Amino acid sequence: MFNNEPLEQIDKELHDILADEEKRQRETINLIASENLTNGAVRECLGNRVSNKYSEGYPKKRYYGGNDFIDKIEELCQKRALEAFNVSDEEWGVNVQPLSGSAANVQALYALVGVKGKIMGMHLCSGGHLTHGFFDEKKKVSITSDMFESKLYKCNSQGYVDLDAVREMALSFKPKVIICGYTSYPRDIDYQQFRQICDEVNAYLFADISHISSFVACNILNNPFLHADVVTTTTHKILRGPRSALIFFNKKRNPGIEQKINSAVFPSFQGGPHNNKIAAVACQLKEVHSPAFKEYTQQVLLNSKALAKALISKQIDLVTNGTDNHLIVVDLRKFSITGSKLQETCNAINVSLNKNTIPSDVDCVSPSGVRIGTPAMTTRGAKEKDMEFIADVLARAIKITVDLQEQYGKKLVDFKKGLPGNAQLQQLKQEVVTWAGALPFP
Amino acid sequence: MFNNEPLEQIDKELHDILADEEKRQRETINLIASENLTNGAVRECLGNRVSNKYSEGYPKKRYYGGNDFIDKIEELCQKRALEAFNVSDEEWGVNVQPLSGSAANVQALYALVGVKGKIMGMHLCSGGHLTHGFFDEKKKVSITSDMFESKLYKCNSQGYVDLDAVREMALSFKPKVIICGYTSYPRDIDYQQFRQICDEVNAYLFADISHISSFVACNILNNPFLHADVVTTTTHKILRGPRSALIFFNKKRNPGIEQKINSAVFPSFQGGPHNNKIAAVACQLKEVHSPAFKEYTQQVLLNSKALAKALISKQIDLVTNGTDNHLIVVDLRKFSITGSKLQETCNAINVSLNKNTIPSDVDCVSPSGVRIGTPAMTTRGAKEKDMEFIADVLARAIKITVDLQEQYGKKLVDFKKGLPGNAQLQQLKQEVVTWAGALPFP
Ligand SMILES: Cc1[nH]nc2c1[C@](c1cc(-c3cccc(CCC(=O)O)c3)cc(C(F)(F)F)c1)(C(C)C)C(C#N)=C(N)O2
Ligand SMILES: Cc1[nH]nc2c1[C@](c1cc(-c3cccc(CCC(=O)O)c3)cc(C(F)(F)F)c1)(C(C)C)C(C#N)=C(N)O2
Ligand SMILES: Cc1ncc(COP(=O)(O)O)c(CNCC(=O)O)c1O
Ligand SMILES: Cc1ncc(COP(=O)(O)O)c(CNCC(=O)O)c1O
Ligand SMILES: [Cl-]
């Protein structure tokens, strides 16, 4: 007693908006540093009937039976996760149930410190995540600043993690956990120095590697698994999996961590796992462990170096004057335009990017930059040669943004009225559309 | 630069376990009160490319642009949610972003009361959810007992919510929130009396209607929207959507609740929404608001009445001696077998059900019952006359369980060696497999 007509037949209204969404994805230069594009197989998993099954608990310790095939999938996902990140299952455990990055982080933090526990993370404005303790004078914006007592450490005036400040803060503050690994940080991390500071105060080392996961797995960047107690990562960004997350824990350094983490995830925070997700993560994690995916990750860094270099060749400034990874932050101060203006200008030409703070911005009220990244376009087949066009397209957008601001004024409402029906934007948009539409699309 | 080979080719190992899972679902009498079967259209949405898009924030106020089509989908979902539950968008709002039921409950509770806040809910062992404040002497098992101060109210010795106890507890405890609507409660809820008790102490009324959502939407059971401040519900149980959740908030009774709930969901707890989920939820809510779906829901209650009646005709005892909804709790005390023994026996014959506490069990250590429900089998096409066969099968499972306990003893490890190779079970399984396999399967 159900309706099995296809999606197009059952709901024509939704099917159009979805077909529209797909066209816009195909015809966009996607430089969102956190986005990627899943293959058809990962998307077969996400729509599988395995999401019908309730399986609260852990493998061989479920609350319900009938979880034999689910238990194999969940055990296969865990095994593949450990192989991908070059860790022995004797020394490391992994929880694969967290529904997303933020949930994983709050669960892992709670496991380690509990309510009223003390944590340290990078400030939002300096490239830290919301779940690293973010707050403001006006409110405790993240639950990680409310259910915990958090203190926030800044990057220096050149945009680098200031280690002497991390130490200074830790010795006064004496937190149980210090979070490293960031959302918009363009350089690699000195995990060893973090491990040295943690020991000095007896705090846990938390490495959130969501943005750089593929680089850690494929050994292109430093390995926090050598120094870290806990490693969290999303599976949807550079790793190219479904929207999910992983919590890694170091048994050898912390006997008894396995139970606290597992109990934090269920039944402290979550209920039933989303088995379609776990299936999909298994499917991608097999791809992560091939040499073909290493080729892909290498290309992400090759594109990102090329892109930063080409942007500097057009006299555009970058925070830290370069990148060690997939992402660049563009400092827009020399043009006297804001990040939100360029984001509007770039949406108007089918270029996907986000506004982003820079070290000079005291506040988060007006970010002076945009953040961009190569994983999405590297997935779509762009090589080092293609990055000169993207830098070209971004340079033109900055110039048009400066023209429009001159004509209509620096207020955002006044700025925007200039956008629709702009001859150059329509021309640039058609240019963006013609190249992007051609590219391989999974 | 991606591998577009189909799931079967790209990963044969996972694909076989998934084809196995599908076969087991097709050949199981699924009586899990919380499970259902999504149609193909809902599963087309869950695997849609819309899950590629990051879209933190809310519609028309996203952090990123490029969210035009996502915003229509998310606006279409909230609209369809308010229409489904017979509420005016002037008086009621809905957040569609929570990833699952437990997340929705923790976020909504945080919005209302904050950290250290006071909440009241039904005890786990009496049919309340984990996220209703569940703790034990030993541990604060749920975050809702830890990030909040919770007190737990029990049902009476006949399995009914004891209102006199709820009121007595509220006047001593003085919580900010009182939770009603449960996981294993076989009767309807007197929300009006709950709303009368909340006013008297000045606490908010929280209705978690995850198990009975289709009954509220279709006007078969009492309507908590007449009385409640907040209504949460999952979309994957009787409602038959994807794995997701909804927080409803009553704007008229509480000005400014809209922002508090929206900010609790993001940026307090979550980050990026899962747009494939929201698409899928949108798609199913169209089906929910149809006369065809109401026919289905009515059939769920008809099958459940019939099933309770047939079980009583075979001298099997039901908690509260019946049901007003989709679910029945069988009390197994007269046979001297435990719920977990029958769960193993029932898994051994492809009958999916769960072990469940009853009123007599002071401790959760040994649940003396099983919980069962009709939504899944009603979806597969069973009618009232089919319920005698399910009651026959369950009676036979209880008897075989008594036989096996006789032979091998009442200790659990001993009990299970009797199960594999048991001639009657192989015979009963074969009976189960032959009937279930034939039924319509979405
Ligand atoms: C949306 C989001 N999630 N996590 C992030 C951000 C992000 C961000 C968050 C926010 C953000 C999000 C939610 C809440 C707040 C608090 C300030 C407010 O209430 O407006 C800021 C703002 C920005 C902006 F300043 F550029 F507008 C940027 C980026 C990646 C979009 C950010 C930065 N900068 C960092 N570090 O991390
Ligand atoms: C698994 C789960 N999730 N939410 C539930 C349950 C559920 C439940 C939870 C639990 C449960 C889950 C997690 C943690 C605990 C604490 C006990 C322990 O640590 O051993 C109990 C146990 C049962 C059992 F007693 F029957 F085995 C049952 C049912 C639906 C499976 C329950 C009951 N009774 C209620 N009310 O709600
Ligand atoms: C370091 C880090 N950790 C956790 C998360 C949270 O993931 P969910 O969105 O799955 O909750 C993000 C997302 N950051 C958003 C961005 O970079 O665009 C992140 O950058
Ligand atoms: C009343 C209630 N609320 C919330 C949830 C949580 O849903 P998630 O699993 O999506 O977090 C459940 C699930 N209860 C499990 C069952 O009855 O089988 C529930 O019964
Ligand atoms: Cl999903």
With a 6 A CB cut-off, is B210 part of the ligand 4 pocket? yes
List CB contacts (< 8 A) between A143 and chain B. 110, 268-269
d(CA B64, CA B55): 6
- Do A143 and A194 lie in one domain? The reply is yes
Q: For chain A, how far is it from start to end, CA to CA, in angstroms?
A: 35
The total of other beta-carbon atoms located within 10 Å of residue B13's CB is: 13
User: Distance from the CA of A158 to the center of ligand 5, in angstroms?
Assistant: 40
- Do A78 and A159 lie in one domain? The reply is yes
Is B41 at the interface with chain A, CB within 8 A? yes
Give backbone dihedrals phi and psi of B196, rounded to 5 degrees, phi first: -60, -40
- Could you tell me which of A347, A302, A353, A363 has the C-alpha nearest to residue A330? A353
| Approach to solving | X-ray
- Do B78 and B88 lie in one domain? The reply is yes
Nearest CA residue ID for atom 16, ligand 4: B34
The answer as to whether A6 is a domain residue is no
Give backbone dihedrals phi and psi of A331, rounded to 5 degrees, phi first: -85, 115
The answer as to whether B6 is a domain residue is no
- Decide: A184 and A33 in contact? Cβ < 8 Å: yes
To one decimal, the resolution in angstroms is 2.3
The percent helix, strand, coil of chain A (3-state, each to 5) is 50, 15, 40
Q: Are strands B61-62 and B57-58 parallel, antiparallel or unpaired?
A: antiparallel
User: Distance from the CA of B1 to the center of ligand 4, in angstroms?
Assistant: 41
- Restricting to B residues 186-225, those with a Cβ less than 8 Å away from any Cβ of A are none
Residue finishing a domain among A277, A298, A319:
A298
Task: Give me the number of domains chain A comprises.
Answer: 2
- Do B279 and B304 lie in one domain? The reply is no
The answer as to whether A64 is a domain residue is yes
- Decide: B363 and B347 in contact? Cβ < 8 Å: no
- Do A314 and A175 lie in one domain? The reply is no
DSSP code for B354: E
- Do B204 and B90 lie in one domain? The reply is yes
Which residue on chain A is closest to B44 by alpha carbon? A47
Q: What angle do CA A54, A58, A60 make, to 5 degrees?
A: 100
CATH classification at residue B318: 3.90.1150.10
- Do A304 and A293 lie in one domain? The reply is no
- Do A40 and A15 lie in one domain? The reply is no
Catalytic annotation present for B237 = yes
- Do B42 and B167 lie in one domain? The reply is yes
Q: Which two tokens stand for residue B146?
A: 């830890």
Give backbone dihedrals phi and psi of A2, rounded to 5 degrees, phi first: -145, 160
Q: Got the DSSP string for B64-129?
A: SS--HHHHHHHHHHHHHHHHHTT--TTTEEEE---SSHHHHHHHHHHHHH-TT-EEEEE-GGGT--
- Could you tell me how far CA B165 lies from the centroid of its own chain? 25
With a 6 A CB cut-off, is B64 part of the ligand 1 pocket? no
Q: Which two tokens stand for residue A162?
A: 């200031």
User: Distance from the CA of A223 to the center of ligand 4, in angstroms?
Assistant: 38
d(CA A403, CA A417): 13
- Do A87 and A209 lie in one domain? The reply is yes
Q: Got the DSSP string for A65-102?
A: S--HHHHHHHHHHHHHHHHHTT--TTTEEEE---SSHH
The answer as to whether B2 is a domain residue is no
Q: Which two tokens stand for residue A246?
A: 């992983």
Give backbone dihedrals phi and psi of A380, rounded to 5 degrees, phi first: -75, 5
List CB contacts (< 8 A) between B73 and chain A. 14, 17-18, 21
- Decide: B190 and B214 in contact? Cβ < 8 Å: no
Is B136 at the interface with chain A, CB within 8 A? no
d(CA B342, CA A187): 57
Give backbone dihedrals phi and psi of B246, rounded to 5 degrees, phi first: -130, 130
- Do B192 and B331 lie in one domain? The reply is no
DSSP code for B50: G
Read off the amino acid at residue B207.
A
3-state secondary structure of B249: strand
Tell the burial category of B283 from Cβ atoms under 10 Å away from its Cβ (0-12, 13-18, 19+).
Answer: buried
Q: Compute chain B's Rg from CA coordinates.
A: 22
The answer as to whether B5 is a domain residue is no
d(CA B215, CA B193): 19
Q: Containing H/E element for B330? A: strand B327-331
d(CA A113, CA A311): 43
Q: Which is catalytic among the residues B26, B53, B54, B118?
A: B54
Length of chain A counted residue by residue: 442
Spatial CB neighbours of B127, under 8 Å, sequence gap ≥ 6: B155, B182, B183, B184, B185, B357
Catalytic annotation present for A54 = yes
Among all bound ligands, the one having the nearest atom to the CA of B132 is: 4
Which range of residues forms the domain containing residue B50?
Answer: 36-298
How many CB pairs below 8 Å do chains A and B form together?
A: 300
Angle between helix B387-408 and B339-348 (nearest 10):
110
- Do B29 and B144 lie in one domain? The reply is no
Residue B438, Ramachandran bin (φ over 0: left; ψ between -120 and 50: alpha; else beta): alpha
Read off the amino acid at residue B356.
N
CATH classification at residue A166: 3.40.640.10
